[PDB]
């Protein structure tokens, strides 16, 4: 007693928007630093009937039965995770149930410190995440500033983590956790000096590596597993998995952390796991290990360096004047345009990027930069030589944005009136569409 | 720069476990009251490239551009949800972003009462959910007993909600929220008398309808939307959608509830929405509104009554001596077997059901019942006449469980040594596999 007609027949309305979404993805220069494109195999997992199964609890300790095959999938995913991130199943554990990155962070944080717990993380404006304790004078914007007592450290005027300030703050505040690992941070992290500061005040070291996961796994960047008590990561950004998260915990340094973290995920926060996610994650974690994927990850970095260099060659300023990873933040102050204006201009030419604060911004109200990254376009087959074109297109967008602001004014509502029908944008869009449309697409 | 080999080629190890899982689902009498089988259209959505898109925020107030198509899908989902549950978009709003039922409840609760907030819900042992404030002497098991202050009300000795005790507790405790709607409650709910008690103490009325959503939608059971401030529901149980949740809020009764609920979901708790889920939810909500799906839902209740009646005809006791909905709780005390023992016996014959507390159970440690329900089997085409066979199989399983317990003892470790190789269980398993394997399977 069910309708088994395919999606096109059963729901034509939805199926056209979805076909449109796909065409837009295929015809866009996607520079969102947090985005990627999943292969067909990962997407076969996500639509697999294994999502029909309720399996509350952990493998070999389920509430229900009929979880024999589900248990093999969850155990295969955990094994593959610890293998991908070069850790021994004796010293490190992993939970594979968190539904997304923000959930994983709130759960892991709760496990370590509990309600009223004291935490330290990077401010949102300086490249921190929302789940690192973000609040505002007006509101406790994240639950992590409300269910916990959070304090927020900043980057210096040049965009680097200011470790002297982390330490001065830690010694007066005395937190149980210090969060490092970030959302829009263009450089590698000194986990060792974080591990030193945490020892000095007796705090846990929490590394959110969601944006740089692949670099950590492939030994291209610093390894927080040498120093961290907890490592969290999403599986959907540079790692190229589905939308999910992973919480790692150091058993050796903290006996009794395994149960704390596991019980935080369930039953403290979640109910039934989504087994299609876990399947999809298992599938991707196999790829992550392969030497082919290390090639991909290296290519992401090569592309990012080349893109930084090309933008500098066109007299565009970058926060920290470069990058150690997949991401760049462009400082837009010398052109007198906001990030939101350039995001609008770039949307009109099928260039996906986001507005992003820079060190000089006191507030998140008017961000004076944009963030770009190479993982999506590296996935689609772009090499170092193609980064000049991307740098060319972004430079042209900045100029057009300056022209449009000149003609229609600095108010955003007034600015956007210039965008529709602009001859140069239609021209620039067409150049983007022709180049992006052709590229390999999973 | 990606591998596009199909799942079987790229990952043969995983594809075997998955095909095995599928075979077990196909060959099983699934009586888990919270499970169902999604159609092909819903699974096409879950595996759609729309999950590639980062779209933090809400439609027309996104952080990023490139979200024109995502905004249509999210707007279509909300529209179809208000329509499906017969509510006016003028009077009622809906958030479609929560990743799952437990998340939806923690988020909606936070929105209403904040940290340290006072909440009342049904005890887990009486049929409440974990996210309704469940704690123990030993631990605050759910976050909803820790980030909130919770008190728990019980059902009476006959298994019904005891309203006199709910008022008794509410007047002295004075919570800001009272939760009703349950995980293993076999009867309809008197939302009107909940509304009357909430008004008396100035508390919000929270209705979690995840198990009975379809009945509410199709006007077969009482309508909590006439009385409640907030209604939450999962989309994966009787509703037959993907794994996701919906939070409904009553604007008319509570102006400014829209923002608190929306801000609670993002950015307080979650980050990026899972657009594949939202697509999948849209797809199912269209089916939910059809007359064909009301026919399905009616069939679920017919099957449940017929199953209750056949179990009573075989001298098996049911909590409340019947059901108004899709679910039955069997009281096993007269056979002197635990729920876990019959759960094990039923797994051995490919019968999926769960152990479940009954009113006489003081603890959740040794539950004296099992819970069954008809949605899954009703989806697979089973009619009223087929319920006699299911009651026949369960009666035989109870007898074998009594036999095995006699032979091997009442310790669970000992009992299970009896299960493998049992001639009657192999015989009963084979009968289950022959009938279940034949039934329609989406
Ligand atoms: C959308 C989002 N999620 N997590 C982020 C962001 C970023 C962001 C950028 C931005 F311009 C604004 C925000 C933001 C998101 C939610 C709430 C707020 C508070 C400010 C307000 O309510 O106006 C700001 C957040 C970007 C990656 C998009 C961000 C920055 N800069 C950082 N560090 O992390
Ligand atoms: C697994 C689960 N999730 N939500 C539920 C359950 C149910 C359940 C049954 C059961 F036998 C035990 C539990 C349970 C789950 C988590 C923690 C606890 C505390 C007991 C302990 O730590 O041993 C009990 C929960 C069942 C629907 C499966 C339940 C009951 N009875 C109720 N009311 O709701
Ligand atoms: C450090 C960090 N942690 C967690 C998350 C996100 O978890 P969700 O799966 O809940 O979105 C992000 C992505 N932040 C958005 C971006 O970089 O574009 C992140 O940058
Ligand atoms: C009232 C209620 N609320 C929420 C949930 C579940 O939300 P998740 O999507 O987080 O599992 C359940 C399912 N409880 C398990 C069962 O009935 O089998 C439930 O019964
Ligand atoms: Cl999913």
UniProtKB/TrEMBL annotation, chains A, B:
It comes from the Eukaryota. It is an enzyme of class 2 (transferase). Pyridoxal 5'-phosphate 1 binds at residues 54, 100-102, 129, 183, 211, 236, 243. Pathway: One-carbon metabolism; tetrahydrofolate interconversion. GO terms for cellular component: mitochondrion. InterPro entries: PyrdxlP-dep_Trfase, PyrdxlP-dep_Trfase_major, PyrdxlP-dep_Trfase_small, Ser_HO-MeTrfase, Ser_HO-MeTrfase-like, SHMT-like_dom. Belongs to the SHMT family. This is glycine hydroxymethyltransferase. It comes from Plasmodium vivax (strain Salvador I). The lineage of its organism: Eukaryota, Sar, Alveolata, Apicomplexa, Aconoidasida.
